[PDB]
Amino acid sequence: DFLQLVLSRQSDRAYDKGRPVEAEKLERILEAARLSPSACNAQPWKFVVVTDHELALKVGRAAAGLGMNKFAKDAPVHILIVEESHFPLIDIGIAAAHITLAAESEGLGSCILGWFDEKEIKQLTGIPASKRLLLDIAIGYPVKEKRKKMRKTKEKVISYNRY
Amino acid sequence: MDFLQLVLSRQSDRAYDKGRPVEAEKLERILEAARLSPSACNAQPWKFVVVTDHELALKVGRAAAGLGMNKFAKDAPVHILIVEESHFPLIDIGIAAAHITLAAESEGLGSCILGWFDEKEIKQLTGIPASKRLLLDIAIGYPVKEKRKKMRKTKEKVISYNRY
Ligand SMILES: Cc1cc2nc3c(=O)[nH]c(=O)nc-3n(C[C@H](O)[C@H](O)[C@H](O)COP(=O)(O)O)c2cc1C
Ligand SMILES: Cc1cc2nc3c(=O)[nH]c(=O)nc-3n(C[C@H](O)[C@H](O)[C@H](O)COP(=O)(O)O)c2cc1C
Ligand SMILES: [Cl-]
Ligand SMILES: [Cl-]
């Protein structure tokens, strides 16, 4: 069920460092991303997929800071989402949902990262200074269990026929 | 395998079967998917205003139409209005929209994300504070027209490995 996939997908903050992601799994994740809807079908994104062992280490280190994202250096894959000139931001959320749901459907863990050293990750991967790097999605096999979800109550987030 | 088949079958449906209602249990599964979306800091900066009343749906759908776009919205029996509840909020709302439309497709329902609409009229019809930003209406209902193949950029334009 789709709902079981939604429930099992979580932010994994620990990865098996020595354990590679298979090329066919990653390709299906990026296909899900590419096939995302977008306003005007503008598809205003580029996914820079870091799979090189040494590069991924460096990208994951540049995602860490201020006590956050220490686990990022352990994920063997980092999908960097660059805005390709409002709706772009909505569109990139769409694509992130498709990446992380696809990762979970493939037995892989993921974590969307909005906090990182944008400058350094852009230098490491040759992204122009003038392009906005918006998210890094870490991908790898998880080592910790499924935590229980915390969400706001229905009444705070959902009303019928009425604000 | 299955997930990718779902991603390919989900599409923007631009015609609805006007007399066929959406089962409440299907709607509830879609809203559960939306609620369970991830968000930066788990802030969940959204409220879903779910229009199921036949007359109100008609009016919200009509207020989505203009410049010859979105004329089919008035035929959708359900409208999920996504209101921002204080960057990340916009990314978060796109996450939630993906969850809603994938969930709709998994239930055998059609959907269309609408970013263009008469925001003031829809707010006035539904009670949404003037000062709160209504960002999307997702129309939900049973489709009339068939599945199309996707038009997307080539892999090479949107995907590069290890370097931009
Ligand atoms: C943020 C957003 C806003 C959209 N607004 C509209 C709209 O107002 N009217 C419309 O007909 N389609 C709307 N679309 C649908 C897009 O045209 C559609 O997703 C895109 O063409 C890709 O086609 P597909 O959804 O059928 O794969 C919107 C999509 C997104 C993501
Ligand atoms: C836009 C965005 C950015 C995120 N940034 C981070 C981040 O930098 N570090 C982190 O540990 N989690 C990050 N997360 C994950 C959220 O904390 C997480 O999705 C939320 O707490 C709900 O938990 P769940 O994803 O396990 O269901 C981010 C999520 C989103 C949507
Ligand atoms: Cl559009
Ligand atoms: Cl967070």
What is the homologous superfamily of the domain B2-144 according to CATH?
NADH Oxidase (3.40.109.10)
| Pair A96, A148: CB distance under 8 Å | no
Rounded Cα gap, residues B142 and B16, in angstroms: 6
Other C-beta atoms closer than 10 Å to the C-beta of A47 total 21
DSSP state of A106: T
Rounded Cα gap, residues B58 and B74, in angstroms: 5
- Interchain CB distance below 8 Å, A6 and B126: no
Tokens 């686990």 sit on residue: A71
Other C-beta atoms closer than 10 Å to the C-beta of B28 total 13
| Pair B80, B52: CB distance under 8 Å | no
Closest-CA residue of chain A to B41: A114
Q: CB-based burial of residue B125 (10 Å sphere; 0-12 exposed, 13-18 middle, 19+ buried)? A: middle
Pocket test for ligand 1, best of B8, B12, B81, B95 (most atoms within 8 A of CB): B12
Helices (H), B17-113: 24-35, 54-64, 88-106
Q: CB-based burial of residue B5 (10 Å sphere; 0-12 exposed, 13-18 middle, 19+ buried)? A: exposed
Q: Which residues contact A118 (CB under 8 A, 6 or more apart)?
A: A132, A133
Ligand 2 closest atom vs CA A96: 31
**Ligand-binding site membership of B29 (annotated):** no
**Ligand-binding site membership of B116 (annotated):** yes
Closest CB from B2, B94, B159 relative to A49: B159
Cα(B42) to ligand 4 centroid in Å equals: 6
Q: CB-based burial of residue B164 (10 Å sphere; 0-12 exposed, 13-18 middle, 19+ buried)? A: middle
Tokens 């660059």 sit on residue: A82
Closest CB from B36, B87, B103 relative to A149: B36
Q: CB-based burial of residue B118 (10 Å sphere; 0-12 exposed, 13-18 middle, 19+ buried)? A: middle
Domain ranges of chain A: 28-143
* Residues from chain A contacting residue B69 (CB–CB below 8 Å): none
Other C-beta atoms closer than 10 Å to the C-beta of A147 total 10
Three-class secondary structure of residue B93 per DSSP: helix
Q: What is the CATH number of domain A28-143?
A: 3.40.109.10
